[PDB]
Design a protein that fits this description.
By secondary structure, this protein is α/β, with parallel strands linked by helices. The chain has a single domain, classed as P-loop containing nucleotide triphosphate hydrolases (Rossmann fold). The chain is built from ten helices and eight strands. Strands 3-4-2-5-1-6-7-8 form an eight-stranded mixed sheet, sandwiched between helices. Helix 7 links the parallel strand 6 and strand 7. The chain binds adenosine-5'-diphosphate (ADP). The site of adenosine-5'-diphosphate (ADP) has 20 residues, from helix 1, strand 7 and helix 9. It is classed as hydrolase, metal binding protein. Keywords: ADP-bound dimer, nickel binding protein, ATPase, hydrolase, metal binding protein.
Length: 254
């Protein structure tokens, strides 16, 4: 199974991705947790300490492997090859979850251009097309990491939104981009709903079949965030919601 989780920053996109990763880590023998969003740490949210996460060097910073994979000094390999060498780009969090941190993309200007991007692209592409084990990658609303090439391999794009017009619009934006790109399934996860009014607002703009589930606002996510980190276990009343979301998710995929 290949999943993409997108959402504007602050919507709780990383928290949702981590939750799904935690829950599906028992239906698969391995899962590629891919942090495609620099602004938030999928690693820490997954339970890693700020030290263990930093140590897992970001794809964008493997300046040597980038030079070697895209040819150096002489050649230039427009199509870097990366497969068996994936497990060298991350760390196993445990016997099931392998984490890869993309690292922030750049643009610069006529200096050291396009190389590293073809590197990350190769990784993403290999993860979705060449690899067979479940993959769950989170990303911002721009879903910049996906391409028509990989889009065909994405079983589902999960748009995480909050219960308000703006955010709902962003969700719809994501649905458009994902669609244009060729992803067949785009489902929503409304996070941080605080009252019933919000739930109604949601239903008034989004169809029922397009909604995976709702996650209530909960102080726990804030407390566990900066101490326990085990923010996703029976201990959390929101886990019931994740279970529902996940179950509904597998009903549509496989
Ligand atoms: N359902 C929720 N209820 C309360 N707080 C939440 C909830 N989901 C996420 N949060 C908080 O939202 C903040 C941003 O989460 P993250 O998932 O890191 O955001 P993004 O990935 O949207 O930048 C985190 O501090 C997280 O604890």
């Amino acid at each position: 199974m290949k999943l993409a989780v997108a959402g504007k920053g602050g919507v709780g996109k990383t928290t949702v991705a981590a939750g799904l990763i935690k829950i599906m880590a028992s239906d698969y023998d391995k899962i590629y947790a891919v942090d495609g969003d620099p602004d938030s740490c999928l690693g820490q949210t997954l339970g890693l300490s700020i030290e263990e996460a930093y140590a897992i060097t970001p794809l964008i910073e493997m300046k040597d492997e980038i030079r070697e994979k895209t040819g150096d000094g002489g050649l230039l390999i427009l199509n870097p090859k990366v497969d068996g060498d994936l497990d060298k780009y991350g760390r196993y969090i445990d016997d099931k979850i392998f984490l890869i941190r993309m690292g922030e993309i750049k643009k610069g200007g006529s200096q050291c251009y396009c190389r590293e991007n073809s590197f990350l692209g190769s990784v993403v592409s290999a993860l979705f097309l060449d690899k067979k084990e479940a993959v769950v990658m989170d990303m911002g609303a721009g879903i910049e990491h996906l391409t028509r090439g990989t889009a065909k391999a994405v079983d589902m794009m999960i748009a995480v939104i909050e219960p308000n017009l703006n955010s709902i619009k962003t969700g719809l934006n994501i649905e458009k981009l994902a669609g244009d790109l060729g992803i067949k399934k785009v489902r929503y996860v409304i996070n941080k709903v605080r009252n019933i009014k919000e739930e109604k607002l949601i239903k008034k703009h989004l169809p029922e079949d397009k909604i995976l589930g709702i996650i209530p606002y909960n102080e726990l996510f804030i407390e566990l965030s900066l101490k326990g980190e085990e923010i996703w276990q029976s201990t959390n009343p929101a886990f019931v919601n994740l279970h529902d979301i996940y179950q509904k998710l597998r009903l549509e995929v496989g």
